[PDB]
Amino acid sequence: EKIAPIVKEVESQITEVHKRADEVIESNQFRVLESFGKHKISDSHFIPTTGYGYDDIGRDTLEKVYADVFGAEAGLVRPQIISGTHAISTALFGILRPGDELLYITGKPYDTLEEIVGVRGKGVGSFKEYNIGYNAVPLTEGGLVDFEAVAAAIHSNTKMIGIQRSKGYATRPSFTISQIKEMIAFVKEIKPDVVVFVDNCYGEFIEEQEPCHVGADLMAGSLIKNPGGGIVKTGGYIVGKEQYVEACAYRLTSPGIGAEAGASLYSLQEMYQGFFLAPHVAGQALKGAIFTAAFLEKLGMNTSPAWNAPRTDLIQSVQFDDKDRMIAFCQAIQYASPINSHFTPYANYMPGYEDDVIMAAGTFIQGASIELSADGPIRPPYVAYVQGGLTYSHVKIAICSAIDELI
Amino acid sequence: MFDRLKNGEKIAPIVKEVESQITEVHKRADEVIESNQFRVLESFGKHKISDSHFIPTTGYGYDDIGRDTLEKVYADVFGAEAGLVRPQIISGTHAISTALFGILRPGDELLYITGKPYDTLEEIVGVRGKGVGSFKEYNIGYNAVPLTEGGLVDFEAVAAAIHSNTKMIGIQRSKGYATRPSFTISQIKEMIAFVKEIKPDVVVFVDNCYGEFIEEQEPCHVGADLMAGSLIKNPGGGIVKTGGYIVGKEQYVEACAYRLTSPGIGAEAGASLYSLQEMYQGFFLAPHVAGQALKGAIFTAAFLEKLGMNTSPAWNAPRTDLIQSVQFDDKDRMIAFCQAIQYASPINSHFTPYANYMPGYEDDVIMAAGTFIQGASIELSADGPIRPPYVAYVQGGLTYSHVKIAICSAIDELIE
Amino acid sequence: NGEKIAPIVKEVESQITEVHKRADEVIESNQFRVLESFGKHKISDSHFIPTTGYGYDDIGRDTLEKVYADVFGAEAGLVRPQIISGTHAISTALFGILRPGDELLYITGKPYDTLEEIVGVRGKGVGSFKEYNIGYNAVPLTEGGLVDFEAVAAAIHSNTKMIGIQRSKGYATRPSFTISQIKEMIAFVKEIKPDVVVFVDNCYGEFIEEQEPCHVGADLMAGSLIKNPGGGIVKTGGYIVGKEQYVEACAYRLTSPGIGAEAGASLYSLQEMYQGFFLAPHVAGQALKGAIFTAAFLEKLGMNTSPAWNAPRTDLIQSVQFDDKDRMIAFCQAIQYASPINSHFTPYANYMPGYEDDVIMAAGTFIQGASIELSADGPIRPPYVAYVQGGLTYSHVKIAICSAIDELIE
Amino acid sequence: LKNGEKIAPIVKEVESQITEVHKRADEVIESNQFRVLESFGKHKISDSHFIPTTGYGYDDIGRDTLEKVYADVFGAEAGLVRPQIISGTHAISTALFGILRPGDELLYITGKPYDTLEEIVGVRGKGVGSFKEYNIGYNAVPLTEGGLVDFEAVAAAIHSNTKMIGIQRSKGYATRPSFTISQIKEMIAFVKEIKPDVVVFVDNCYGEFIEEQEPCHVGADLMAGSLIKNPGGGIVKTGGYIVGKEQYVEACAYRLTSPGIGAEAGASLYSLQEMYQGFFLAPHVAGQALKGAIFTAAFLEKLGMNTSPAWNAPRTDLIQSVQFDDKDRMIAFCQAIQYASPINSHFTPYANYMPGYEDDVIMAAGTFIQGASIELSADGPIRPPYVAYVQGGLTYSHVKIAICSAIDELI
C-alpha cells in the first residue's frame, strides 16, 4: 500500500544512527553486566523482608549496584521513595537547611518543582516555611546556560546547584552529559563547596555516562521511567556521593533510621531484572523516537529533535500544524496502545495552563513514561510529544497506525 | 488445656486456680473486645467496604479508593477526621518523626510532658547523634518535662514550661522501660485539657504504641490533635507485614502527609501494591488480637505472682496498654525464662537468645523474639536489661493459648 | 431491642460457660501440638522464601507439607496453592488412587453434590469415573444417622479399591461423625478387606477435636485450606495427607507422572500457610465457641437448633430452625449486613443451579468462599433451616447474631 | 575484553553477513506484535483485568479473558492458560490425559518425544499413573534417517483405536530439525484424511511467535507449552498453556481442575499483569533470542565449529547448537556463558552426574526465573563431538556480549 514504501525508505535512511544506538546499548548493557558480576547478585537477593526490614542484603546491594553503574559512591533506590518527584524533593530537602539557597542554572524547571519551592501553593511544607531561598537563572535566548548570570547569582548562601537534563515541555535542547560536565566544572570553580544536583529523568542509558560520572554530587529519577525496563511498578532513586546520600536517607525516613530500615516486600526482583533490561528497553524508545522524527519529516512536519541529532534522552516531538491533525494522531496512539485501547483521548482543560491539552497514554503502569504515550498542549503550531516504547516494534506499529488513521 | 508435659503436673493445679481467679478481668477484656470489635464493624458498614477496596494500584498511586478509604476508616475508629495509614510510613518510629516534622518549623519548641521519651526520640530531637537531619539543624526546640516521683505529670512544671514558642506538646502513653504507669485515657483526657487552657493554640500529640484497642477509646477521642503508631503492632491483627498510621485533625494530618511525600503531591499518591487486604483485615481482627495479648499480660501477672515474683502491672490493675513485666530477681532464672519463651514461639524457636551488649546502655540485655514478622510486637516476645532485680518485659501474644502454653513452658523449663 | 436482649445473652453465656472452656481445652491442646511440630522442624522465616519457574527443591514448601503431616497423624503431606479448592483435593485424592477396574464405596451415605459430579452419577461424566470404567456406590445411612454396617459389609467385594467417608454433614440431616465414630468405621472395613484404602473428606473438621481422621487409622484425607487449617489467613489451597505411597500417588495425579512432588513454584504464599496453621487452632476455636452460642442463644429464643449447644462437636456446622420463610430470609440478610465486608451487598432468594429450591446466602468474607468466616445460608424451604456457621473471632459471631435477632424484633 | 581486537572485526563481519536474516526476523516480530496488539484492541483489555482473585477464583474476568486472547492470537477457539499449570511438561500431560481414555492409543508421529513424555506413558515411569495403568497404548513412528516423518509408517500405525496424534515441534536433543508450521500443516492433513476422527496435538514449546503462525492456524486440535518460555516474555514467573478447539480445552479443563468445576474456579492471585504484559512483549523478546541464535551460528561457524541450524537456515524455534569438538572447550564455554549471565555468575558449574543420562551434562543457567529457557542458557551432554546448546536471551545484546565474552574467555 501507500505507507509501506516510505517506511521502507525511512528505515533505510536512519540505519546509520540506528546501528549506533545499538552500540551505546551494548556498552550500557556490558557495564550493567559487570556490576551484577562484581556484586555477585543471586536470587537470594530477590528475598523479601518484612516488618522493620533490617538486614535486607537485596535492598542494600541493589542500591550499591545502581550507584556503581550511575557512577556514584552511594545509592538509595527503594520502593518507599514513591516517584521521581518525591526523590528530588527528598534530594533537595535532604540537603537544604534554613538560610540556604538552591540555584537552578537551567532556568525555570518543570512545573512540580514550583510547588516544592513553595512558589505555587502558599507553602504546604515548602522552602518558603523553612526560609530556604531558591533562584532560577534563565537560559540564553540561544538555549545555552547564562554562565554570566550563573556566576553572578552564586554566593555564600548558595548551598546547592540544580540541573535538569531533559527539556520536557520547555523550549530548548535536552542537555547533554558533555554540556553537563562543562557545567559543574564552571560552578565548582567558583565555589567547590556547593553540592551539585542533577535531575536525570529521561536521560538514563541513552548516553554512555550519567551526570555522576562527571562530578555531580547527587542525582535522581523515577523507576517508572528508563532505569526500570518497564517492569518496576513504582519507586525512585537517589545516587551520588556517600555523604549526601546519607542525608537523603535520614530525610526520607527519620534520624535513628537513616537507610537501614523499611521492608522490601515483594519488589526486589522486578527492579534487578528491570535494570538489566533497562539499557535495551530505553534503546527501543530511542530508536523509536528517531524513527518518529525521520518519519514525520518525510510526511512533511517539523520534528524535534531531528532524527540525526544527538540524543541525551527520550524526548521527541512533531509539529502537525493542524489541531484536527494533532488530536486524531494522539487518539490513533491511545488506540494502538496495548491496555485501554478503548478509552479514547479527548481535549481536557489543563489546570494552570490557559489552554486545553490532549493526553494519550495506554500503559501497563500508571504514568510509566518509558511506555508509548503521546500528548501536548492544544495550541499552534500544534506540537504533540510522542515518546516511549517498550519495544521498537510497538513504536513502529503505533505511528504507522497513527498515519493510517489520519492520512 | 494440655498440661500433659514434663514437670507440669504440680503446675496444672495452679494454672487451674489462677484462671479461676482472673475470670473477672478476662470477662471484661472480652467485653471491650466486643465493644471495640463492634465499632470496627459499624465503621466498615458506613464506608461500605468491598473487595473492590482490596484492589491493587501501581505507578504514581492516584485514585486509590481502597487506600483513601482505609484511611478514613482508621480515623473513624480512632476518633479523628483524617488519617494516613500506608506502607510508605515504614514503622511506628517513622510515623512519629513524620508527625513531628510534618508540623514543626524553625523557631518552634516541642514540649514532652510525660517525662523522658523512649530512647529513639533522642535521635529525632537531635540530642543523641547529630548532623542527621535532627531538630538541632532546624532550630526546633525541645524539652522533656519530667514526671512526679510518683510517676504522675508534674502539672505545675508543665504550665511553667509552656510559652508562646511551644508549638507542639508531647504525650507518651505506654511507659516502655520507664519506671512509671502507662498513662490512661482518663489520665490523658485531663492531661490535654490542662495545657489546652494555658495555650488554646498548642497542638497535642500522643504516641499511641501498645495502647490501641485496650481501652474503649483512643487519644483522638479526648482532645489530642494527632497520634500515630506501628501497624506491626496492635491495629495490625498480627497480619500486616509493615506500616505506620497517622490520625488526627484534617489539617495537621495534611501537613504530615506533605512531609511524608512532598509539597504538591500531598497524600493522594504512592501506590498501594498488594498491602490493602491484610490491613483492612488486621484492623477488623485487631481489637481481638490485642485482646488475646492483653489477657496474656493478665495470666502472666497472676501466675508469676503466685509463684512468688513482683509482676507489673498486677493482674487486677487497670490497663491502657499491653506492657507487662515480672521480677525474677535472679540473672540465671531471668535468662532461662526469656530463652524458654524464645523456644516456645512458632518460628526460630531454636535460635536460643543470649546476653548481648546493648549500645548506649551500660548493661547487657537478652531478647526472646520468635515472631511471624520481623519485630512485630503484637506477637509473644520477651526481653530486659540484665541488672538487679532482673525485670524482664514479657508481653504480646497472637492467641491466648500461645501465651498460656508459652509462659507455662517457661516454668516447666525452670525445672533446674 | 437491645435492653431486652442483653440479659438473655448474659444468661446464654453463663449457661454455656463449661462447654466453652472445653472448646478451649482442645484449642490449647491443638495449638500446643502445632507449636511442637513447628518447634520440631526448626521452621524459620527462611521457610517463607518465594520460588518461581519449576519450583524445584523448595525446602519452604516440602517442609510445610511435612508439618501438616505430623500434626494430622499421617506419614506424608501434600498441600499446595495449586490445589485450588477442597473439591480439588478430593478429586485429586480419589482419582490419584482409583484405577480402571476399581470401585469407590462411600459408607457415610450420599456425599455432597460435588462428588455427585466427579463420579458421574449426575453431571455428564466430564472426566468422571464412568469414562474411566470406575464404579461408585454410596451406602445409605441408618434411619437414625448411623452407618449401615450390614449394607456396608455386603457391598465390599473384590473390586473395592477404596473406602469413602465424609466427616461433616453438609446439608444432610445426619450428625457429623466423630474421630471415634470414624475409627470404628475403618477398623470395620480393614477387617473385611485389609486392602481397601480408607479416605476421609475432613473439611470443617480440623482442630475441633484433639485428633484428626489419620490419627485413628485413615489411609488418606483431604480438605480446603481457605477453611479451618488456613486460619482465615491463607488465600488459596488444599491439603491431602496420608501414607507415603498414597500421597506420592496423589502427587502423580495433581502434577504429572515423573514430576511427583518435586515441582511447583510456591510464589508469594508460604508465610500465610504456616501462620494460618499456627493460628488455625485458636481461630477454628472462635467459630466453635461462636456456634454453640448460636445454638444456646437461639434455643432460648424458642427455635430448634442442631447440634445442641451441649452436643459434642466434631466440626463447624451449625443450623437453626426458623419455621418461617420471611424470618429465615431476614436473618441471613441481617448476617450479611453484620459482616466486615460487603455489608451493603444485601442478598435475597435466588435461583440456584441444581436445587429444586431457592437459597439465601449471606457471605461477608475477606477471602472468596472461606467458610471459616461467619456465613449464613440455606435452602429456602420448610421448615426453613439456615446454616449459621463460621466466624474469625468469637466477638464477630456474637455481635452479628445479636444484630440478627435485632432486625427480627423490629 | 582482553582478546578483543581480533574479534571486533569478526563479529563486525558476522553482523554484516547476517544483516538480511535479522531484518527477516524483525518482519515477523512486527507481524507477531501487531497481532497481539490487535487482539488486545479486540478484547478492550484494561488494568481491571489485572485484578487478583482469591478463594474459589470465581467471577474472574481477568483469567478467562486472558485465555481468549491467547486462543485468538494462537488461532484456537479456547485457551487454558492459568498458573494452576506449573510448567510446559504439565501443560502437555494435562492435555494428553485431558483427552485420552481407556482403550485408546497415542500415536506420536514425529518420532520419539523428549524424555519426560516417557515417564508419562509408562515406558520408564514404573507405571506411576502413566498411560500403562489406564490401559492406554502409546507409540512413536520413528522418523526417516532423512529426518522427515515416515509417512508410510504413520499411515499403517493408525488403526481404529488411534484417538490422538502427537506432534512435537521443537527438536530437543533429537538429532533432527525442528519442524515448521508448513511441515506441520501437511502432517495434520495426512492424518485427518486417514482418520478424520483423530485429535492432533502439538507440543509447541520454543516455537511460539517465532513464525507468523502457530500450530492451530494450520489445523491442529490442541497445543501446549510453558509460560516461563517464549510466550511468557521472560517476565512471567510461572505457568503453562493449553490452546485449541472448544470441546478439547473444556475437556482439558476437567482433567486439570476437576469434573463438574471445569474452568470456573482457580484463584489468580497477583499474576494477571505479568502474563498480559508478557504476552505483549513476547513477540519481541523471542526475537532478541532468535536474532541471537542466527548470530551465534554465524559467529561460531566462522570460528570453525559446526552450527545447527545454520545461521541462514529458516527458523521454526529457538533451539541452537554448536559443535565444539573438544570436551574442555565445550565445558569452558558453557562456564564462560554462566559467568556472562546477569544472576548466579559466580556459581561456576562443571561436569556432574545427571539423573537419566549415561553421560554427565554441564548446565549454565544464570536466569531470573528458575528454568525459563527464554533466557540465555548454555547446556549439553559431555560426549563427542561435544555439541552444546547456546540458546535463548532476553535481549540481542546479552546474547552478543555473552558469547563474544566466551570466545574471549577461551580461544
UniProtKB/TrEMBL annotation, chain A:
Alphabetical list of SUPFAM superfamilies matching this protein: PLP-dependent transferases
- Entries under InterPro entries matching the protein: Met_g_lyase_put, PyrdxlP-dep_Trfase, PyrdxlP-dep_Trfase_major
Domain of life per record: Bacteria
Pfam families per record: Met_gamma_lyase
Q: Which PANTHER family did the record assign? A: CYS OR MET METABOLISM PYRIDOXAL-PHOSPHATE-DEPENDENT ENZYME
Q: What is this protein called?
A: Aluminum resistance protein
The organism that produces this protein has a lineage beginning with: Bacteria, Bacillati, Bacillota, Bacilli, Bacillales
From TrEMBL, chain C:
Q: Give the lineage.
A: Bacteria, Bacillati, Bacillota, Bacilli, Bacillales
Biological source species: Bacillus cereus (strain ATCC 14579 / DSM 31 / CCUG 7414 / JCM 2152 / NBRC 15305 / NCIMB 9373 / NCTC 2599 / NRRL B-3711)
Q: Which SUPFAM superfamilies match?
A: PLP-dependent transferases (SSF53383)
InterPro entries the UniProt entry points to: Met_g_lyase_put, PyrdxlP-dep_Trfase, PyrdxlP-dep_Trfase_major
Q: Which domain of life is it from?
A: Bacteria
Q: What is this protein called?
A: Aluminum resistance protein
